[PDB]
Design a protein around this ligand. Structure first.
Ligand SMILES: Nc1ncnc2c1ncn2[C@@H]1O[C@H](COP(=O)(O)OP(=O)(O)OP(=O)(O)O)[C@@H](O)[C@H]1O
Ligand SMILES: Nc1ncnc2c1ncn2[C@@H]1O[C@H](COP(=O)(O)OP(=O)(O)OP(=O)(O)O)[C@@H](O)[C@H]1O
Ligand SMILES: Nc1ncnc2c1ncn2[C@@H]1O[C@H](COP(=O)(O)OP(=O)(O)OP(=O)(O)O)[C@@H](O)[C@H]1O
Ligand SMILES: Nc1ncnc2c1ncn2[C@@H]1O[C@H](COP(=O)(O)OP(=O)(O)OP(=O)(O)O)[C@@H](O)[C@H]1O
Ligand SMILES: [Mg+2]
Ligand SMILES: [Mg+2]
Ligand SMILES: [Mg+2]
Ligand SMILES: [Mg+2]
Lengths: 82, 149, 413, 219, 411
């Protein structure tokens, strides 16, 4: 129930709260990322793509990023976020 | 509530009123309305047996905070047995006269009906109807029927 | 002589021992669970939004055209026609649910294309024919035409060099060489049953021929034939055996025909009556008048004893391919299939493993191959050793097949 | 006007009725068992009576009914409909068959595989009455049928069908046809051009799905 | 294309319970008074922030004239229909509940890309026109079986079963949390698990502890739940059960008391026996039959195992068979230790008195002993619990199992 506060910026909490990784928040972010919601200047949501991977200690999270990189080559324009 | 009946206007199919007393065509036998039954003191000589039933039925309902402070789970299962003609059914009716609670009478042989699957599921519909009257006591008549082996 | 309750003695209990934090900790837990509720009805954000398009394209339609398509547009129904009479319409039309009317044609029709048995658009007030329709196609056979390749090659059905050889003769060879049968003067069989122990490879042979078919292949869900209404399941049989006659040489695979009828009895005067009507309708469109021609039927079961002798007759089911256990050369080939794509030691032997699985199936052999890698994750390894498999045999077979013969073994050495 | 076939389900019940439709021109009307069962109420008695009124319009027309036991069952009482339309389709068959006098022109043929489903007191007098049972082929009737279906192949002329009836026993007519089909493909395995007595003997074991090894008892 | 339909556009809804499972003092200490007041602070602020959220909204446009006339364009008694075929000239055919079929039009703002014969739609009464399309279409018998609450405590609740705790974790938790080990050997994790053994051992606890500590969703099935009387209603609910589990999260399904769902598949003389036997034969088909499976795990549990259908016991369907035997003289100490956590224990007692002297009794027996001995303290006006409570309790619980077997033949 937000607007500019939520759908632009409020994912940097998860890019600041922990860097350990656990599938509660690691799966809650692609609920709002696989739904890109492209009507906004989508690099707001693609900024939330960027530090979604602000969790260190390497993991099995390659399943999310490479599959979103596959839809991210053609769509989610490679001019901006490749 | 989901799975609840409502009053629907035939004018424009507008909702009118939430209708209570949910679908249950077989609580005629259960929850007997009147209890002008026998009393508590005409049992006469089963005092060891009677006081144990206070510990399991009266005491958790009247004072649940004792089991909180003592730190144990509360009991819920009672079995009554013996030779025939030894006061097994008075003690059901004596409790039902003094329970200050919902009393659900189920004899132990009407859970078969005639069609498979509906002869079972009303048992599931029985106990979920006991959640409505949130304190309740449900009684079994003569489990030498279903429950054997 | 044991009684220890009186209302004054109740007040002893709940004041002795932590009178400070008893209710102080309790109602904090109580009203927060109340507050778990009061957040939920304050949210109320269920939002079952559906039906709507993206709201940037329909703007042209819902300006006036939607209001223009309320009153002039029609709520006409579709029906079926029995016949017609000469010099006039005299059209006799049924609904099969409503009544049967005798009505007139309208002005917007051509009186030639009002052929019999045709779906036609019918007015609601005076019930005149307006628009004829294309014929109805059955909606659920379209759901079960597979249109999809499951990826199993014949190189994964090892241990069955002769059962595939029998199955290659019936299905594949008349569809690719329909010459040597005629040029010698024989006819191929048209029905093959598969029977044997479970987990032996029934589904694999059906899954692998769906790969290499180059033809129409129809999976049939067995319990769709059983319905709630009387005679509905028998009508589903008919639509299946009509469209197979339209195209040439379509394959139909049933599976677990134990469920759709195994025996015909009546002693208690009742029972599985509606199942028998669907099952006997299957028989009369299998043999009888009007033989089917190029329709091949494959069936598979685990319990072949309990089937009807009306289906056991050749002419309906002609070849009885059975699956057995692989002796030793089969199993040594099976281990090389299910363990080639896993990180193992490159020096182990598999013939010693095929000894220790005397009466085993292809499913049990694969379970040993999966379990041996699970022991490698119990330790910290990335390749499988010989003792990884040897513990896996004892885990799968010897933990359930024998418990008296292994410790007290000294009758046999 | 009533002829009933019965027997074991491999003897040629449908095979006999197709030849009678073949050589005679008298407006053959086929009819199956479960065709009379419909979903809505009272539709089967419509389908029963309209076909009988159709077969009355043609004079020489005769009617064949296959799997009469699909509806000809011991009627039982109920409370949830179910079978309580089938007897209305059954009695309409019983009312129409006693509806007309037995003047031979609309002779009716029926055939079932099991007798013990049918209603015996419901036929018994002037209904389906003539009993034509189909027994299993004895010895030479097996050797006749195996000679019939082997008409279209290259049989080498050292094969006695009487020698085949020695080893083939308790078979119906269709299993005798199945030996004839499978023997043609065993010769196709090794690419043989004609058949032999050994080719049939392996085709016999394939019908009941047998196979033989070296059993190390038999020297 | 390569990524056709982008896999059904569908998210997952997991549980909302387990707000803070850290009440770890486990006693009347000020920490638990301090910890729970912190939870009171955040939920009150979450209340007041969303209270300010529906308060300070001066935005009104309603729908900028577009959806507002659309909500008046559609009828107010919105009805439910069913597609039969698609005549794509913006004039299609539908079917009602009775089967009255109508040549209706499409009254816009519906993309003709997610409507298939079988998908239920939304209709009018005055013109019966297609207004929307009904989504999710779940029959309300399977939504009852969708668990929303984590009922009990975690793996530290049960009293020591660690050889078999590590077994079920290999097939449920570890493949979902860390599936990097399995790709290094290409081995798919096991799917089916049977829990079997004598009653009163811990079968129902082990499912509840998994349903507590999980991330995917959870489905419970109580035995004779998928049994109806309409001869096709039985197997039809099983299809919708696995359909919902497949459409949602990569989740697990717990079907308990499967001894009433399988016995050796014999053929007999009763007609109601077959609709029993047929529903239980197509569960076999949905489990490991055709097509594939998806990421759906199945956990099954009985008391007796030998009276089951051997078609279900085979691998491919169930890859783990787990015995739950009656306890020992070592892990039984952990049973008595946990069930005597928050009770006032007098220092006279020895836990090893009742353990070593008697060597037969379940874990559910031990919970009954701890509750009965607590009732004996109030029976003789006490708070602390001594040895004499456990002397009378160990008697009174165990007198429900018969005297013995054979006499001294063996020696
Ligand atoms: N201790 C008792 N005091 C007074 N009346 C008793 C006593 N025991 C039995 N009765 C009499 O027995 C009858 C009730 O039967 P009871 O409650 O024993 O059921 P039951 O005989 O145990 O059931 P069943 O017939 O199945 O064994 C009543 O008439 C009651 O007055
Ligand atoms: N001959 C074989 N070669 C290789 N793998 C096999 C063989 N037989 C079985 N398997 C393996 O066993 C698994 C299960 O086999 P499958 O379920 O097809 O047996 P089934 O006979 O169809 O079972 P059911 O009789 O219950 O339908 C398959 O996935 C396959 O990998
Ligand atoms: N006496 C016979 N002469 C020639 N061929 C026969 C004979 N009996 C059986 N057959 C062959 O066996 C097959 C079985 O005959 P048919 O199709 O009539 O089956 P049926 O006995 O009517 O089966 P059901 O009684 O179960 O309907 C026929 O196709 C036919 O080719
Ligand atoms: N190992 C254990 N540790 C702690 N408590 C246990 C243990 N085993 C059983 N319990 C107790 O048993 C109860 C759970 O019963 P359990 O899970 O054994 O039922 P079940 O195995 O499904 O029985 P049934 O098979 O008869 O339905 C819990 O209340 C718990 O206190
Ligand atoms: Mg009594
Ligand atoms: Mg199979
Ligand atoms: Mg026939
Ligand atoms: Mg249990």
């Amino acid at each position: 129930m937000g607007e500019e506060i939520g759908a632009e910026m409020a994912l940097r909490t998860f890019g600041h709260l922990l860097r350990y990784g656990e599938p509660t928040l690691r799966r809650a972010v692609p609920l709002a990322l696989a739904l890109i919601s492209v009507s906004n200047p989508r690099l707001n949501i693609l900024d939330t793509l960027s530090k979604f991977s602000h969790d260190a200690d390497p993991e099995v999270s390659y399943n999310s990023i490479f599959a979103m990189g596959m839809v991210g080559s053609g769509t989610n324009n490679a001019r901006l976020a490749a | 509530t989901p799975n609840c009946r409502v009053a629907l206007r035939n004018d424009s199919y507008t909702l009118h009123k939430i209708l209570p007393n949910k679908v249950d065509p077989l609580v005629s036998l259960m929850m007997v309305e009147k209890v002008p039954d026998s009393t508590y003191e005409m049992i006469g000589g089963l005092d060891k047996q009677i006081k144990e039933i206070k510990e399991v039925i009266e005491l958790p309902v009247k004072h649940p905070e004792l089991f909180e402070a003592l730190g144990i789970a509360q009991p819920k299962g009672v079995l009554l047995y013996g030779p025939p003609g030894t006061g097994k059914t008075l003690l059901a009716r004596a409790v039902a006269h003094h329970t200050d609670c919902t009393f659900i009478r189920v004899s132990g042989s009407e859970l078969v009906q005639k069609f498979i699957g509906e002869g079972a599921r009303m048992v599931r519909e029985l106990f979920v109807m006991a959640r409505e009257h949130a304190p309740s006591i449900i009684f079994m008549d003569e489990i030498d029927s279903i429950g054997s082996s | 002589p044991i009684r220890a309750l009186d209302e004054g003695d109740i007040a002893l209990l709940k004041t002795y021992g932590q009178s400070t934090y008893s209710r102080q900790i309790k109602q904090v837990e109580d009203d927060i669970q109340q507050l778990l509720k009061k957040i939920n009805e304050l949210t109320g954000i269920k939002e079952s939004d559906t039906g709507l398009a993206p709201p940037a394209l329909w703007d042209l339609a819902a300006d006036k055209q939607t209001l223009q398509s309320e009153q002039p547009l029609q709520v006409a129904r579709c029906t079926k026609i029995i016949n017609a009479d000469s010099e006039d319409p005299k059209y006799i039309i049924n609904v099969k649910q409503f009544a049967k009317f005798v009505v007139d044609l309208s002005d917007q029709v051509a009186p030639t294309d009002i052929e019999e048995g045709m779906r036609v658009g019918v007015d609601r007030n005076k019930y005149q024919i307006h628009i004829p329709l294309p014929p109805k196609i059955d909606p659920t056979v379209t759901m079960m035409q597979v249109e999809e390749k499951p990826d199993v090659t014949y190189s994964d059905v090892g241990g069955c060099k002769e059962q595939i050889e029998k199955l290659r003769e019936v299905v594949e060879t008349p569809l690719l060489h329909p010459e040597r049968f005629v040029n010698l003067g024989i006819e191929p069989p048209k029905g093959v049953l598969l029977f044997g122990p479970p987990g032996t490879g029934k589904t694999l042979c059906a899954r692998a021929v769906a790969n290499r078919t180059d033809a129409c292949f129809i999976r049939v869900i067995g319990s769709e034939l059983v319905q709630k209404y009387v005679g509905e399941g028998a009508r589903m049989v008919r639509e299946l055996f009509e469209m197979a006659r339209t195209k040439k040489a379509c394959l139909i695979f049933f599976d677990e025909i134990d469920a759709i009828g195994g025996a015909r009895f009546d002693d208690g005067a009742g029972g599985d009556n509606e199942v028998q009507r669907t099952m006997l309708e299957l028989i009369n469109q299998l043999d009888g008048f009007d033989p089917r021609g190029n329709i091949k039927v494959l069936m598979a079961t685990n319990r072949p004893d309990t089937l009807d002798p009306a289906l056991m007759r050749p002419g309906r089911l002609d070849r009885k391919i059975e699956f057995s256990l692989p002796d030793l050369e089969g199993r040594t080939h099976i281990f090389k299939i299910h363990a080639r794509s896993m990180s193992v030691e490159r020096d182990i032997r598999f013939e010693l493993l095929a000894r220790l699985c005397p009466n085993s199936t292809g499913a049990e052999i694969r379970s040993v191959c999966t379990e041996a890698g699970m022991f490698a994750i119990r330790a910290r390894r990335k390749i499988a050793t010989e003792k990884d498999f040897l513990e896996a045999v004892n885990k799968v077979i010897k933990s359930y097949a024998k418990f008296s013969a292994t410790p007290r073994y000294m009758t046999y050495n | 006007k009533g002829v009933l076939m019965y027997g074991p389900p491999g003897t040629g019940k449908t095979l006999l009725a197709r030849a009678c439709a073949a050589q005679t021109k008298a407006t053959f009307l086929k009819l199956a068992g479960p065709q009379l069962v419909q979903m809505f109420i009272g539709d089967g008695a419509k389908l029963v009576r309209d076909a009988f009124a159709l077969a009355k319009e043609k004079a020489p027309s005769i009617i064949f009914i296959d799997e009469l036991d699909a509806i000809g069952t011991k009627r039982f009482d109920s409370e949830k409909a179910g079978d309580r339309e089938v007897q209305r389709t059954m009695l309409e068959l019983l009312n129409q068959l006693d509806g007309f006098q037995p003047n031979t022109q609309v002779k009716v043929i029926a055939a079932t595989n099991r007798v013990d489903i049918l209603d015996p007191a419901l036929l018994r007098s002037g209904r389906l009455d003539r009993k034509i049972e189909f027994p299993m082929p004895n010895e030479e009737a097996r050797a006749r049928i195996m000679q019939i279906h082997s008409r279209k192949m290259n049989v080498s002329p050292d094969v006695n069908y009487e020698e085949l009836a020695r080893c083939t026993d308790d078979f119906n007519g269709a299993q005798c046809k199945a030996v004839c089909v499978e023997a043609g493909m065993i010769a196709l395995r090794r690419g043989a051009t004609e058949l032999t007595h050994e080719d049939y003997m392996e085709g016999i074991l394939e019908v009941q799905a047998k196979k033989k090894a070296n059993l190390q008892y038999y020297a | 294309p390569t990524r056709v339909g982008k896999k059904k556009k569908k998210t997952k809804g997991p549980d909302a319970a387990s707000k803070l499972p850290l009440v770890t003092p486990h006693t009347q200490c000020r920490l638990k008074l301090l910890k729970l007041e912190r939870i009171k602070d955040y939920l009150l602020m979450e209340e007041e922030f969303i209270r300010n959220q529906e308060q300070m909204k001066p935005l009104e446009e309603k729908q900028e004239e577009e959806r507002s006339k659309v909500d008046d364009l559609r009828g107010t008694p919105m009805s439910v229909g069913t597609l039969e075929e698609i005549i794509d000239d913006n004039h299609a055919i539908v079917s009602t509940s009775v089967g009255s079929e109508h040549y209706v039009s499409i009254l816009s703002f519906v993309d003709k890309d997610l409507l298939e014969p079988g998908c239920s739609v939304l209709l009018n009464h005055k013109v019966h026109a297609v207004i929307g399309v009904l989504m999710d279409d779940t029959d309300p018998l399977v939504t009852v079986m969708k668990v929303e609450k984590a009922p009990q405590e975690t793996y530290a609740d049960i009293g020591g079963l660690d050889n078999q705790i590590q077994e079920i974790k290999e097939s449920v938790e570890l493949p979902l949390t860390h599936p990097e080990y399995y790709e290094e050997m290409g081995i798919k994790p096991p799917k089916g698990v049977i829990l079997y053994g004598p009653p009163g051992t811990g079968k129902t606890l082990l499912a509840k502890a998994v349903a507590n500590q999980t991330s995917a969703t959870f489905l419970r099935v109580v035995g004779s739940e998928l049994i109806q009387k309409y001869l096709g209603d039985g197997p039809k609910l099983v299809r919708e059960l696995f359909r919902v589990a497949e459409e949602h999260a990569p989740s697990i399904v717990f079907i308990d008391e499967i001894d009433a769902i399988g016995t050796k598949r014999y053929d007999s003389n009763s007609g109601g026996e077959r609709e029993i036997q047929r529903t239980m034969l197509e569960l076999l088909n949905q489990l490991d039959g055709f097509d594939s499976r998806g990421d759906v795990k199945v956990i099954m549990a009985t008391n007796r195992i030998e009276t089951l259908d051997p078609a279900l016991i085979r691998p491919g369907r169930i890859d783990r068979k787990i015995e739950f035997p009656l306890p020992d003289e070592k892990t039984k100490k952990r049973i008595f230790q946990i069930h005597t956590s928050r009770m006032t224990l007098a220092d006279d007692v020895t836990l090893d008195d009742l353990i070593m002297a008697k060597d037969d009794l379940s874990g559910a027996d031990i919970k009954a002993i701890c509750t009965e001995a607590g009732l004996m303290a109030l029976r003789e006006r006490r708070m602390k619990v001594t040895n004499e409570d456990f002397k009378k309790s160990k008697e009174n619980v165990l007198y429900k199992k018969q005297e013995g077997t054979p006499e001294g033949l063996y020696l």
